[model samples]
Target: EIKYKVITKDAFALPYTIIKAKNQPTKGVIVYIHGGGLMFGKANDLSPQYIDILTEHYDLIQLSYRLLPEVSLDCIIEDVYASFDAIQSQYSNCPIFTFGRSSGAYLSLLIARDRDIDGVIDFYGYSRINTEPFKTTNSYYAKIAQSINETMIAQLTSPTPVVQDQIAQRFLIYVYARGTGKWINMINIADYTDSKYNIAPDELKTLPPVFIAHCNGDYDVPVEESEHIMNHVPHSTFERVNKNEHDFDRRPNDEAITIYRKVVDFLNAITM
Candidate 1:
């Protein structure tokens, strides 16, 4: 059975649900974070999609954090950490795995980097937001930023190196925009090192295994974003679904089921 509750100590209470395993404690516990571009989405949004599959093998907890504009990024991260700490206090013996999609994927990566999460699953997330190159007149010299963007674009269309690089290079320029350099840089630091977030690559090393999956044609969060993550996390697993788009499994279908099955299988493999 899945039980729901609201963690209301602070003014902005976070909603969460717990899905307990039927027989006994199996492999580990999973904490799910929902995606809504850090602005929308709720804890309940993911209940229908993830709870059933996760509960079959391990205990599950789905949580909601503060959204952006209304709240700061630091606040959201803190809420996630607090929620995880609270869950951990109760289930100390079980290993914890974090799962998220889109912006939630970014959160999962950040949490895994900062906290001692046992494992992380990013459904099309980006580590550093610099998949494009450009010229700028800032304190930092202007140059094209290159990462996993090229590889991902290649996986999406044809496997041509030149085409992929060109596509990625073009896409980056369009997405980054010209005047938003400072804001973009603030979010895409490799370390989160100098920024208030202070997240680092070395910190990423301490994280448990990672699993990434994305739809090749997704334009919203681009498959390349997830590819950027795959490139950095050496032991991570990346899966690309050719014809799937964003929100691929909103409805019940063979393709959707296939994606869900792959996710469940990956969780089982790592947690077990």
Candidate 2:
């Protein structure tokens, strides 16, 4: 069963859900962070199949953070951190791991870097936001943004930090940000290329064991982002999916099943 509650004491009212293992004692807790370009998405967006597979041996905690444009990137990171700390304080005896997809994967990496977590899982997430592809127009999303209106994006902008929003309504804002190379500015980061905003190559050595997965030709985040981490992190496992689509793990197909099982194996190895 999944029990939902507000985890943070802050004004944002960030919420989390605990999906418990049904028939066996859980080995640990995996805190999952959702991804929608960091602009919009809910904590409960994990696919049913993935949830089922994870809950077989471990309880799952899905977390929400303040969205971009509504709050600075650092603020969003802090929100997740606070929520993770809350869970840690309450479940102090259970082993913990940070897991995320896309933008959430980036936050997961940070959490494992700074916190005393057993491991981290990254699925098609970028480690550096200031790369050339982000600073300049993206060919894929740019074409889509061309059809959207500036007023439409303006209408969706919220006045305060929001824990969740629909991607269908808010994706236009991300499209605009990527289409015009304004993503860094939208997140309120100055000098985005600065090492402070990203995980420096040297700092990668400090992270716990990470299970990083990415497609070979992901148009959204690029494959090299995961490759960079794989190259630098000493204790890391890199899985390269042959598919080109980002977030392919959402599918419950044969390949996804194999990948998810591997995730379970990785978690077990690190914990024991």
Candidate 3:
């Protein structure tokens, strides 16, 4: 059974869930961070199939943070870190691994980097926010910026009770807009990093160990992001899943299953 509770101390009451394993020896705890471009997301991104497989080995905790317009990217990362700390407090001596997808992947890197723990498994997340992938000639810059501006207006002006759909829509829009610097409110023609997550290569090495995976065909984020990250970390490994989209890890394909098993093995091996 999954038990839900608020991770935050008082009334932000940011909700989260935990599922204990029925299996013995409590291999470790996997803290799941969800992806939605940091603007829209839920804690429950893991499928029952994935959960069932992992729960056979370890306990799992899933969580969410305040959404965009409601909070900034800095605050989102802060919430994720707090949730990790809250969960880790429950299993003080147990090995803890953070698993996240897309933007969640980005957040997990930071959480697990400085924290004393096992490591991280990042799926389709970027190490830094850069515009290089866009490779655009300033054409899409203003266009994407206008869209974000309009969405911000709608989100602020929308009536009482608001619209969840609006949140979803802007999140989808910014996923593409983020490839450029505009969505993040910068006007640089050349790609650059956000100090918030620009993690120096050396800083990345501070992590215990990591298993990074991304789709070779990922248009949302290039495999190079994970590739370059592996270059920096002293003990990091990466896999480039082929012919798949961003959320390929959730699927039940032969490739996905094979990689999933590899994840389990890696986790088991590294608990040393």
Candidate 4:
């Protein structure tokens, strides 16, 4: 059993859940982040298969942060930083790693960029925010983008930050952002390539060991994103899966399971 423990109290009561190791002693802490295109996702989004495997060796944490449009991308990133800081302080003696899927993976990279995290596991995550694909209509999201009205979009935005579930209403907002190439605008960043918003080449070289996994046929984020990370980040490892889905880790299969085991091995290599 698991439950959420509030890490901070501000605009939103941010919380995180911890799944203790099934083994006697904890190896380290894996700070897990969830992906929702920076719009919608709960901290509990990780697949059970992943939780089961990871908890066997180390404590697995699911971090929650404020969503986009309600809060700028900068603010959302800060939320993650704060959550990580809290965890780091609590587990100062143990190894710490940041891991996430999709946007979560993106945030994990960002944390690694500014913090002294032991390592990062990026599962189908992108490094840049203002890439051409983000600024252009996404063929995949275009099909799901709802023809929502201005009023419906307004209803989703709130005065304070929000941690929304993957509801149809919140998801529609993300769909609209992606389908119209306005996700960057919604995040309200000045320059997409700015080092503050993305990982610069120099920063990439300095990041600790990174493990990246992406499918070749991913249509949502494109496989090139992970490939870029693999090519640049020093001491980074990349695994190119043959599956065709963007969030392939959501419902684990034989292929995903294979990758998860390798991820454990990578963790062992670094933490040792």
Kindly indicate the candidate among 1 and 4 with the higher lDDT: 4
Q: Which stretches of candidate 3 lie over 4 Å from their true place?
A: 7-10, 134-171, 179-181, 186-195
Query: Can you write out model 3's per-residue Cα lDDT over 150-219, one digit (the tens) per residue?
Result: 4454454224211123444555445445534434542222324655557887787787788888989786
Best-fitting candidate, scored by TM-score: 2
The candidates, ranked best first by TM-score, are: 2, 4, 3, 1
Q: Model 1 — TM-score against the truth?
A: 0.71
Ranking the candidates on lDDT from highest down gives: 2, 4, 3, 1
Question: What would the per-residue lDDT of candidate 4 be over residues 1-272, giving only the tens digit for each residue?
Answer: 56655555454567877889899688889999988899887888777888888889889988888898877887788788888887788788998999988999999998999888889999999888868888899988776565676577777666666776635567778888898788888897666677787788888889899988898999889999987787778797788888778877767888889889888999899878
* Number of colliding residue pairs in each model: 2, 0, 0, 0
Which residue pairs show backbone clashes in model 2? none
The lowest-lDDT stretch of 10 consecutive residues in candidate 1 is: 157-166
TM-score of each: 0.71, 0.94, 0.82, 0.93
Q: What is the per-residue lDDT of model 1 for residues 116-136, given as tens digits with 9 covering 90 to 100?
A: 767887776655433342123
lDDT values for all models: 0.61, 0.83, 0.70, 0.83
Residue 14 lDDT, candidate 3, scale 0-100: 60
- Global Cα lDDT for candidate 3: 0.70
Model 4 clash tally, residue pairs: 0
**lDDT winner between candidates 1 and 3:** 3
Q: 81 in model 2: Cα distance from truth in Å? A: 0.7
Worst 10 residues of 2 by lDDT: 1-10
